[PDB]
Amino acid sequence: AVKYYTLEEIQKHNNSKSTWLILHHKVYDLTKFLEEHPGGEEVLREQAGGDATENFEDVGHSTDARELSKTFIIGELHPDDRSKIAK
Ligand code: HEM
Ligand SMILES: [Ca+2]
Ligand SMILES: [Ca+2]
């Protein structure tokens, strides 16, 4: 009962009205969060419409931040795109 979104669809959610990104094959709707994110808005905007897995780990996000991230999950990357995008 995973909801899947294609990469082609996710790429459209790249603006102030709808900003999504991908972390570890899951899709996060950060449209509203980016106004609250402690790391600022632009790092998230930069990533909108695509995968940001590497950026998210490289920062060293706290466990608290991971836990918070789960609240923004709206679905997962379609299986057809899971060799293009890794996990
Ligand atoms: C839904 C996903 C995300 C959530 C919930 C989130 C949450 C947070 C929170 C709560 C902090 C404060 C420090 C901490 O708790 O570790 C933080 C800091 C930061 N975040 Fe995120 N973040 C997310 C995604 C990202 C992404 C994808 C990037 C980069 C593209 C990013 C870049 C940063 C930076 C640069 C800081 C500031 C430096 C630091 O505190 O280490 N964040 N984030
Ligand atoms: Ca703000
Ligand atoms: Ca703003």
Residue numbers in the entry: 8 to 94
Manuscript text:
In this work, we report the crystal structures of porcine b5 determined at sub-angstrom resolutions in both the oxidized and reduced forms. The haem Fe atom is coordinated by two axial ligands, His44 and His68, and the haem group is not bound covalently to the protein moiety. The haem orientation in porcine b5 corresponds to the major isomer observed in the rat b5 structure. The comparison using high-resolution structures revealed that structural differences around the haem group may be important for regulating the electronic properties of the haem.
The crystal structures were determined at resolutions of 0.83 Å (oxidized form 1), 0.93 Å (oxidized form 2), 0.76 Å (reduced form 1) and 0.95 Å (reduced form 2). Form 1 and 2 crystals were obtained at pH 7.4 and 5.5, respectively. One of the Ca2+ ions (Ca-1) is coordinated by the side-chain carboxyl groups of two glutamic acid residues, Glu42 and Glu48, located around the axial ligand His44. On the other hand, the uniform C—O distances in the oxidized form 1 structure indicate that the 7-propionate group is in a charged state. Unrestrained refinement was also applied to the 6-propionate group in the oxidized form 1 structure. The C—O1 [1.253 (9) Å] and C—O2 [1.246 (10) Å] distances are consistent with the results for the 7-propionate group. The hydrogen-bond distance from His68 Nδ1 to Phe63 O is 2.893 (6) Å in the oxidized form 1 structure and 3.097 (5) Å in the reduced form 1 structure. The interactions with Arg89* and other interactions with the neighbouring molecules in the crystal fix the structure from Phe63 to His68, and small spaces exist between the adjacent molecules. In addition, water molecules were found near the main-chain atoms of Phe63 and His68 in the form 1 structures. The water molecules form hydrogen bonds to both the main-chain carbonyl of Phe63 and the main-chain amide of His68. The hydrogen-bond distances in the oxidized form 1 structure are shorter (0.2–0.4 Å) than those in the reduced form 1 structure.
